[PDB]
From Swiss-Prot, chain A:
Tissue expression remark: Detected in forebrain. Detected in dendrites of neuronal cells. Expressed in the pyramidal cell layers of CA1 and CA3 and in the granule cell layer of the dentate gyrus.
Binding site for L-glutamate: 89, 91, 96, 142-143, 193
This protein's UniProt keywords: Cell membrane, Disulfide bond, Glycoprotein, Ion channel, Ion transport, Ligand-gated ion channel, Lipoprotein, Membrane, Palmitate, Phosphoprotein, Postsynaptic cell membrane, Receptor, Signal, Synapse, Transmembrane, Transmembrane helix, Transport, Ubl conjugation
Subunit structure: Homotetramer or heterotetramer of pore-forming glutamate receptor subunits. Tetramers may be formed by the dimerization of dimers. May interact with MPP4. Forms a ternary complex with GRIP1 and CSPG4. Interacts with ATAD1 in an ATP-dependent manner. ATAD1-catalyzed ATP hydrolysis disrupts binding to ATAD1 and to GRIP1 and leads to AMPAR complex disassembly. Interacts with GRIP2. Interacts with GRIP1. Interacts with NSF via its C-terminus. Interacts with CACNG2, PICK1 and GRIP2. Interacts with GRIA1 and SYNDIG1. Part of a complex containing GRIA2, NSF and NAPA and/or NAPB.
Molecular function GO terms recorded: AMPA glutamate receptor activity; amyloid-beta binding; cytoskeletal protein binding; extracellular ligand-gated monoatomic ion channel activity; extracellularly glutamate-gated ion channel activity; glutamate receptor binding; glutamate-gated calcium ion channel activity; glutamate-gated receptor activity
Record text about domains: The M4 transmembrane segment mediates tetramerization and is required for cell surface expression.
Additional record remark: The postsynaptic actions of L-glutamate are mediated by a variety of receptors that are named according to their selective agonists. This receptor binds AMPA (quisqualate) > L-glutamate > kainate.
Record's comment on post-translational modification: Palmitoylated. Depalmitoylated upon L-glutamate stimulation. Ubiquitinated by RNF167, leading to its degradation.
Site (Crucial to convey clamshell closure to channel opening): 121
Species name: Rattus norvegicus
Site feature: Interaction with the cone snail toxin Con-ikot-ikot: 64, 148, 240
Protein name (database record): Glutamate receptor 2
């Protein structure tokens, strides 16, 4: 039928999507800025559609409840028909691929470790062999599922500890994880994606560090409901943007160009 | 069902002839990362398969004149093979004619020098002429330079395409040999995965310099609209999540 405005679900997560200074004076898409805002604009341009950015209601990436088998987060928006497309740092995973489509990845990352500087930890190994320094992950996302599902010894041991720790080591948002690392005098380390880790490492007060190698290797993709007519074009747009070097530029713009911890 | 025809390419350590292969037969002739991968994929998708080395020994490019596709890509496009399991780069032009799974490995274009060569970056290469440099024929690296609007890469392209003698090579091994036999006067542009594998092998006389010039992935390819596509993609994701892709990389990139 006639062209319709495309509903883009996304998540407030720096530096992917952030409230512009003066957002209280702005409306619609103008309220926001960031890597995924820029990406959304480029994708819409290359696929020839109009769109409306909408922050996911429950503020989550997406997990399926093991009881009700209901999906929440951005994945839920797509599965239940609330949004037409998701443009966010949304990790490509098997369980998600089974219910939604993903474009080829637009960004690579791996699970990694964030510490307050000087913390005596340099690996997942180290974390698992001690109990003084607590550690956890984001709720309702791909990192928690990674530990829950892992059959690798060190990671299995970390999960056994995490899932029962008290008080809870899990946080509802990345910002909550960061604050907890920053305020815990070295007694909390945070497991998050290297992209977010690296972004925070360049933010004031420059008191956090990525340590160790990545625990795994994967990517973010743009998601659409299964069998959506947008999928193909969006995949091509991502490949074109990648090959033009636009994704590389966008990353430097939002991570490094105006980093706050020196050159 | 049918025996799935797998096209692939002799490229270490992805696919290599085993020692004594001449008395061996069929799939047992070969070993390497993609050989193991093919076995895992087949097991997870429930098919039997026959590994075959691509006839012209190429990855895949479209002729600008004829617009015919060669290499593994051509074999998919013209129905000679059902699936390609090789270090085949996901690209826009290819994706327009065949299907790719989500990537099973990451890589970027990179620079290989003979140790001691006074070069640290692509920019260095482009600002001089004592040291010649080139790429593989009929693959994504050559197209990369052909299409780049980025100044440094565009300058390298301009030099490489008119250089005499030719700086382009038919196989990765000929590029590596060329770097080794050229007394520092030839540098080779190739994917970081292959660069790093070679760097760890004797005679340990080559080196990767600079960062990767780009960032991309290898994918498993099927003819456009193949029924095999979906299952293979779920297989790659499961293998990735189970840590198996990481294990295979550690095994084949285990001299120096
Ligand atoms: C820079 C962009 C370019 N993306 S593109 C489509 O041009 O290739 C990029 C992002 C991610 C990767 C990448 C490659 C391989 C792997 C496997 C280890 C896992 N693969 S998966 C889909 O299950 O996460 C993960 C991520 C490569 C490139
Ligand atoms: N990108 C992740 C969220 C971040 C994390 O889990 O660390 C996801 O899609 O679930
Ligand atoms: N992986 C490349 C071949 C090697 C190269 O181009 O450097 C391709 O699929 O074309
Ligand atoms: Cl032999």
């Amino acid at each position: 039928g006639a062209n319709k405005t495309v509903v883009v679900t996304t998540i407030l997560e720096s530096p992917y999507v952030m409230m512009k200074k003066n957002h209280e004076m702005l409306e619609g898409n103008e309220r926001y800025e960031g890597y995924c805002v820029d990406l959304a604009a480029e994708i819409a341009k290359h696929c020839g559609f109009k769109y409306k950015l909408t922050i996911v209601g429950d503020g989550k990436y997406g997990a399926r409840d093991a009881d009700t088998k209901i999906w929440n987060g951005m994945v839920g928006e797509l599965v239940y028909g609330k949004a037409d497309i998701a443009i966010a740092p949304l990790t490509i995973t098997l369980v998600r691929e089974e219910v939604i489509d993903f474009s080829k990845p637009f960004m690579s990352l791996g699970i990694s470790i964030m510490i307050k500087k000087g913390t005596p930890i340099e690996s997942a190994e180290d974390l698992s062999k001690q109990t003084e320094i607590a550690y956890g992950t984001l709720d309702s996302g791909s990192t928690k599922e990674f530990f829950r599902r892992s059959k690798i010894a060190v990671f299995d041991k970390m999960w056994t500890y995490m899932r029962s720790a008290e008080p809870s080591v899990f946080v509802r948002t990345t910002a909550e994880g960061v604050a907890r690392v920053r305020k815990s005098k070295g007694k909390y380390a945070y497991l998050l994606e290297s992209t977010m880790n690296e972004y925070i490492e360049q933010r004031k007060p420059c008191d956090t560090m990525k340590v160790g190698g990545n625990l795994d290797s994967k990517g973010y993709g743009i998601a659409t409901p299964k069998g959506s007519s947008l999928g193909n074009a969006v995949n091509l747009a991502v490949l074109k943007l990648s090959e033009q070097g636009l994704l590389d530029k966008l990353k430097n713009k939002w991570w490094y160009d105006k980093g706050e911890c020196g050159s």
